[PDB]
Structures are given as C-alpha cells and as structure tokens.
Amino acid sequence: VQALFNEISADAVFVTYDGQNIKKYGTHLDRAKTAYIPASTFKIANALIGLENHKATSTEIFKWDGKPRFFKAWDKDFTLGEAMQASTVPVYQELARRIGPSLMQSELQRIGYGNMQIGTEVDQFWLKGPLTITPIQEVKFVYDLAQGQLPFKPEVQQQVKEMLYVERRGENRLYAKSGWGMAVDPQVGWYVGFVEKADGQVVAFALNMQMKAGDDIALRKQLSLDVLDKLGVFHYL
Ligand SMILES: *C(=O)[C@@H]([C@@H]1N=C(C(=O)O)[C@@H](S[C@@H]2CN[C@H](C(=O)N(C)C)C2)[C@@H]1C)[C@@H](C)O
C-alpha cells in the first residue's frame, strides 16, 4: 500500500474515518491537516444548502442555454444528481446564484464547512478561494452525510447521498465525489466519499493529492479504489 503510492511521483494522502478513528496513508501525511480549495467536491455542500433552503429539487432539470461550456460534456441538460457525477460547474453556479451570497455564507458558517469563508462572489469561492478545507474535514463531512448527522433535513441528506451513488458491488455500495482544482497553484486533486459495506459498517475516505496538467483524469479514482481494496474496505469484484 505504501509501495502503491510512491510508484508514482505523487504527493498524496488518503484519509479514512469509521466514526471514531482517523487513519492516514500515503506519501505526504501532513496534507491531511492542510487546507485546500474544495473545487468540485463543494457540490456536496452546494446541493445540501440548495435543497434545504428550497432553492432546487432533486428532480428539476437544469437545461442547457445553448452557450458552449468549458467541456462539451457539459453541453446538455442535467438534474442535480446528473450534474454531480458530471461535475457540471455551470449547473451548480446557477444553484449558488439561487442561494445568494448572504445565505450561502450563513449556511456554510452554520454547518462549519472548512474555514467558512466565501468572500464576495457566490459562484467562484470554491474554485479559487477563499474557501478552503482539510481532508480530515472532508472525511468527517461526508461521513456525517452517510449517517444523516449533518445539520440538514434527513430527506435532504438522503437525496444528496443518492446523488453520490457511483457503484454497487454485491451488497456493498460506493458513494464518491471527484475534484480537480485547476485555477490554483498547486493544482489539487480530490476523491472523497464513503463505502456502505455489506456487514453494515460505513467507512468514509478522502484522497487528496497534488495534480498537474498532464495527469490522467481516472488516476484519482483508480488510486482510491486500489487503496480501498488493499484496506479490505471495498474489494475488487
Ligand atoms: C471540479 O473539481 C472540476 C471538475 N472535476 C472533474 C473531475 O473530477 O473529473 C472534471 S469533470 C470532467 C468532464 N466530465 C468528466 C467526468 O467526470 N466524467 C466523464 C465522469 C471529466 C472537472 C475538472 C470543475 C471545477 O471544473
């Protein structure tokens, strides 16, 4: 497992949380206490705040306006769950604008997300600062989501949970959200979520690593599933 991490030149940390103990793995363990921009992983909080404050529903279709977006994959209609797995930023920037800077700021402070700072721009704060979060805060945030213990309505947490559902492996279920912050130096890579194992135990996780332009998109998820197999949390099918 240690040999897996330094097989790359990757500066990475992998955090796990079972509700009582944080475990750290990787090449750079101090990354777990270091704050980084959430990037696309903020969509979890964005979706929670939007649904809790009745600014959107999990069945609403955010239609494309016809203007080309940063990726052509984003040039289509999305629900919030579809936009979550596609990481469709323009759909969640529209959600952030429905929420507004003052409610977004008060809600992120209410739930204690990261450093609870958003600045002035309601559709940019998670992509270039000032909002930052540590990987330990990320594992605990998504672990609380898995248990329905976040300061949100129970049906709201359930809806966002199903928005993160990415794989069923027998009676085991993987929930995850990827992130790549490219508008910061250095670039940050996230892979955050939890596994609902067949025995009933929940294990949250968060990969956090340095990234650069050449990196393959699939590397973060590959690395996380690799480690999860080695940990015994999520064995390959
Ligand atoms: C969020 O961190 C940024 C987005 N995160 C991405 C990522 O984690 O892959 C990409 S999404 C990109 C286009 N859709 C593809 C995809 O996820 N699938 C085909 C499943 C990859 C994007 C950089 C966002 C802030 O730009």
mmCIF file of C-alpha atoms and ligand atoms in Angstrom, residues 38-41 43 70-71 73-74 85-89 126-127 177-182 190 217 220, ligand 1:
data_model
loop_
_atom_site.group_PDB
_atom_site.id
_atom_site.type_symbol
_atom_site.label_atom_id
_atom_site.label_comp_id
_atom_site.label_asym_id
_atom_site.label_seq_id
_atom_site.Cartn_x
_atom_site.Cartn_y
_atom_site.Cartn_z
ATOM 1 C CA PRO A 38 -12.817 22.115 -2.273
ATOM 2 C CA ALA A 39 -13.164 22.585 -6.067
ATOM 3 C CA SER A 40 -15.817 20.176 -7.433
ATOM 4 C CA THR A 41 -16.307 18.491 -4.044
ATOM 5 C CA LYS A 43 -21.095 20.407 -4.938
ATOM 6 C CA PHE A 70 -15.793 24.627 -20.583
ATOM 7 C CA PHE A 71 -16.257 20.980 -21.583
ATOM 8 C CA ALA A 73 -19.686 17.021 -21.990
ATOM 9 C CA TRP A 74 -21.414 19.850 -20.084
ATOM 10 C CA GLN A 85 -21.358 12.890 -11.431
ATOM 11 C CA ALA A 86 -20.505 15.030 -14.469
ATOM 12 C CA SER A 87 -19.050 17.741 -12.167
ATOM 13 C CA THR A 88 -21.056 20.240 -14.224
ATOM 14 C CA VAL A 89 -19.900 23.548 -12.730
ATOM 15 C CA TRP A 126 -14.987 27.203 -4.063
ATOM 16 C CA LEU A 127 -12.910 27.349 -7.268
ATOM 17 C CA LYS A 177 -17.290 12.766 -5.497
ATOM 18 C CA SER A 178 -14.214 13.722 -7.518
ATOM 19 C CA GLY A 179 -12.488 17.087 -7.634
ATOM 20 C CA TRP A 180 -9.715 18.783 -9.612
ATOM 21 C CA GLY A 181 -8.900 22.397 -8.784
ATOM 22 C CA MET A 182 -7.051 23.790 -11.788
ATOM 23 C CA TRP A 190 -9.805 15.184 -4.556
ATOM 24 C CA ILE A 217 -8.478 12.087 -15.099
ATOM 25 C CA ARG A 220 -7.652 9.689 -8.576
HETATM 26 C C1 LIG B 1 -14.217 20.039 -10.144
HETATM 27 O O1 LIG B 1 -13.349 19.720 -9.339
HETATM 28 C C2 LIG B 1 -13.876 20.299 -11.628
HETATM 29 C C3 LIG B 1 -14.303 19.059 -12.422
HETATM 30 N N1 LIG B 1 -13.791 17.845 -11.786
HETATM 31 C C4 LIG B 1 -13.566 16.955 -12.750
HETATM 32 C C5 LIG B 1 -13.159 15.726 -12.456
HETATM 33 O O2 LIG B 1 -13.119 15.363 -11.256
HETATM 34 O O3 LIG B 1 -13.051 14.880 -13.368
HETATM 35 C C6 LIG B 1 -13.764 17.440 -14.069
HETATM 36 S S1 LIG B 1 -15.253 16.737 -14.897
HETATM 37 C C7 LIG B 1 -14.586 16.247 -16.491
HETATM 38 C C8 LIG B 1 -15.582 16.354 -17.643
HETATM 39 N N2 LIG B 1 -16.582 15.360 -17.205
HETATM 40 C C9 LIG B 1 -15.747 14.159 -16.994
HETATM 41 C C10 LIG B 1 -16.318 13.174 -15.942
HETATM 42 O O4 LIG B 1 -16.258 13.409 -14.739
HETATM 43 N N3 LIG B 1 -16.868 12.046 -16.431
HETATM 44 C C11 LIG B 1 -16.921 11.818 -17.885
HETATM 45 C C12 LIG B 1 -17.416 11.077 -15.470
HETATM 46 C C13 LIG B 1 -14.381 14.734 -16.541
HETATM 47 C C14 LIG B 1 -13.752 18.972 -13.855
HETATM 48 C C15 LIG B 1 -12.315 19.479 -13.919
HETATM 49 C C16 LIG B 1 -14.658 21.524 -12.086
HETATM 50 C C17 LIG B 1 -14.499 22.632 -11.042
HETATM 51 O O5 LIG B 1 -14.152 22.016 -13.335
#
